[PDB]
Write a protein that binds this ligand. Structure first.
Ligand SMILES: C[C@]12CC[C@@H]3c4ccc(O[C@@H]5O[C@H](C(=O)O)[C@@H](O)[C@H](O)[C@H]5O)cc4CC[C@H]3[C@@H]1C[C@@H](O)[C@@H]2O
Ligand SMILES: [Zn+2]
Ligand SMILES: [Zn+2]
Ligand SMILES: [Zn+2]
Lengths: 119, 113
């Protein structure tokens, strides 16, 4: 079975940084495009970043531009997300989601890792 | 970006009900080469979002015959013909026709009073 396990969430002070990991299993990680989607308290979903199987970012929202980095370690079958200068609005459930060629969208999603921005 | 307005925001149901929920796109999904790339996810309570249907009408792997999708352009519908407890949760439509990929306002399927 396709599995995605995110980790690295927790408490971060206002202006701090976060580094999330998403370890993949049950599929050939290296051939799939990947994404990070966060879910706010309101249950709203928003795409944070997407990366090709080659390790090249293919999407960042103009707003997170400059404080976000999506990376992958194909050999460790791991996807990463780096965010800096966290603000109150960065508090969310962060999901890693696999991209499906036939869907032209997300198919599987991890369980999410929570980032709580604090003062 | 493309706003996906889901109606109703909340839908109280009884098990065995047949329901239809709506997803209205702020812009046409037939304006380019990627025609109606409109998908549906179910976020069951305490679980991760699961793909139900993609590209309007295609049932993802494991999705029962009770689920179906329709629409073209801007108005899309997800229909559930006999709601089971396993169908309750938050339904989000999503579009990948236009950049960036966006998610709908959601429809919470919940047991009626
Ligand atoms: C997010 C996005 C819409 C969804 C698009 C998508 C969706 C699935 C997908 O599946 C991948 O398709 C690759 C391919 O096309 O070869 C396959 O090799 C991989 O296995 C598979 O993961 C690839 C892509 C390419 C770019 C993505 C766009 C970039 C943004 O601008 C836009 O908003
Ligand atoms: Zn803001
Ligand atoms: Zn818009
Ligand atoms: Zn918008």
């Amino acid at each position: 079975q396709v599995q995605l396990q995110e980790s690295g969430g927790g408490l971060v002070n206002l202006g701090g940084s976060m580094t999330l990991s998403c370890v993949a299993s049950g599929f050939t990680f290296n051939t799939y495009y990947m994404s990070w989607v966060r879910q706010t308290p309101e249950k709203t979903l928003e795409l944070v970043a997407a990366i090709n199987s080659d390790g090249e970012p293919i999407y960042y929202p103009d707003t997170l531009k400059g404080r976000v980095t999506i990376s992958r370690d194909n050999a460790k079958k791991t996807l990463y997300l780096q965010m800096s200068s966290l603000n109150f609005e960065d508090t969310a459930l962060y999901y890693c989601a696999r991209l499906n060629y036939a869907v032209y969208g997300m198919d599987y999603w991890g369980q999410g890792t929570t980032v709580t921005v604090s003062s | 970006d493309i706003e996906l307005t889901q109606s109703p925001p909340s839908l109280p149901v009884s098990l065995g009900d047949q329901v239809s929920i709506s997803c209205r796109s702020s812009q046409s999904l037939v304006s380019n080469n990627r025609r109606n790339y409109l998908h549906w996810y179910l976020q069951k309570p305490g679980q991760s979002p699961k793909l139900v249907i993609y590209k309007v009408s295609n049932r993802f792997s494991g999705v029962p015959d009770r689920f179906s999708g329709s629409g073209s352009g801007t108005d899309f519908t997800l229909k559930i013909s006999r709601v089971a407890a396993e169908d309750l949760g938050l339904y989000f439509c999503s579009q990948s026709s236009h950049v960036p990929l966006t998610f709908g306002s959601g429809t919470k399927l919940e047991i009626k009073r």
